[PDB]
């Protein structure tokens, strides 16, 4: 509103994005009904299908925009291939900060690792989460954009995570009164949002620790240098930090 009018003039990084979309992204207007569109900007509710060059140019500008503030509503739809974009709107009992301790993280890392074992296999853990300061506390979002398994296979993964009780006690270790129902049944089939995109009447999320692990076919049980937005994004198969697992 009033704030959004300010960034359009005061600063030029948003203005830089405006020039790119008016000329380059303009020709890539895509119908909303079709699923071919990969970019859905909620600033104006428009769907865009961008190729790799148009995507990466869009991604690159996004990080600089976040470093200088501003507000954005850019979203990307969940496609037929993506990483573990599994939102967890954890409705805690109270707004008590549960620390993402590496011991507790390894509990979550290994259990979600266990779930992806009983599926198609031959791992970058992006622990983005809500800035909190709201009733119902934050929404944890682990993302593994390297792999390409965004199909009904993830629905079995969705069911396994939802039916999982091992993660439940780990969330119970965090003081969460909602161990499940945080993972929506359509977590890996509904449009997602690029890291740093502001939400409807809510601030953009932040990433706690963007760590990673390694997976081996024979033995399964094993940051300011990359553009964050593309790295967390699922479509970026040509990613530098991430690789198309």
């Amino acid at each position: 509103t009033i704030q959004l009018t300010a960034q359009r003039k005061y600063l030029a990084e948003v203005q830089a994005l405006e020039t790119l979309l008016t000329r380059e992204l303009s020709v890539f207007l895509t119908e909303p009904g079709s699923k071919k569109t990969n970019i859905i900007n909620r600033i104006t509710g428009k769907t865009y299908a961008l190729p790799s060059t148009e995507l990466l140019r869009l991604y690159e500008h996004l990080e600089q925009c976040r470093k200088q503030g501003a507000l954005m509503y850019f979203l990307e739809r969940q496609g037929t291939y993506s990483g573990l974009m599994l939102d967890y709107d954890l409705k805690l009992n109270t707004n008590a900060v549960p620390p993402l301790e590496p011991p507790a993280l390894s509990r979550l890392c290994h259990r979600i690792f266990v779930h992806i074992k009983n599926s198609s296999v031959l791992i970058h853990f992006f622990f983005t989460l809500k800035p909190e300061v709201v009733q119902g506390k934050y929404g944890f979002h682990v993302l593994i954009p390297g792999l390409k398994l965004a199909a009904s296979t993830k629905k079995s993964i969705i069911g396994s995570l939802q039916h999982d009780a091992t993660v439940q006690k780990i969330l119970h270790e965090q003081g969460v009164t909602n161990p499940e129902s945080c993972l929506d049944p359509h977590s890996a089939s509904v449009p997602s949002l690029l890291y740093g995109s502001s939400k409807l009447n809510h601030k953009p999320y932040q990433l706690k620790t963007g760590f990673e692990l390694v997976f081996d076919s024979s033995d399964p049980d094993y940051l300011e240098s990359y553009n964050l937005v593309s790295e967390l994004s699922l479509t970026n198969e040509q990613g530098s930090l991430v690789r198309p697992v």
Partner: protein, 139 residues
């Protein structure tokens, strides 16, 4: 600005001089706008072109914004050391003149100037001449 207005809405307005010697404005009524009952698809006499006054300040601003963004785009592209002067003086003068369209006196002057462009001879005396046309409430 009057010429751009005429080229942009030349199909909805017409001006002619009555017997008393004063210019009058006629507006073509289209569905979907506030109006009295029964004058659809008919010319309507207007003492002062209110719709043109609103349209000058409402829709023309989009074209002005397009000009501004065009100047911005040419500013972004690097050509030489002269663009940083020409596409800064021209730009500055442009935002200085941009707010002029919102002034009342400038709008009145633009309307008076456009009175000449929109004038169409042999219109008033040709109104309601042929007896084979009747003005009804639905056309």
């Amino acid at each position: 600005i009057a010429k751009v207005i005429y080229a942009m809405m030349g199909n909805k307005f017409v001006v002619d001089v009555d017997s008393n010697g004063k210019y009058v404005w006629f507006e073509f009524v289209l569905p979907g706008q506030p109006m009295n009952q029964g004058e659809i698809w008919k010319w309507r006499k207007e003492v002062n072109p209110d719709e043109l006054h609103i349209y000058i300040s409402e829709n023309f601003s989009r074209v002005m914004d397009r000009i501004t963004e065009h100047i911005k785009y040419h500013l972004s592209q690097p050509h030489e050391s002269n663009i940083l002067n020409y596409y800064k003086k021209l730009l500055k003068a442009f935002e200085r003149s941009k707010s002029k369209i919102f002034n009342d006196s400038f709008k009145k002057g633009v309307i008076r100037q456009a009175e000449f462009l929109f004038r169409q001879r042999s219109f008033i005396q040709t109104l309601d001449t042929n007896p084979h046309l009747l003005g009804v409430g639905n056309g």
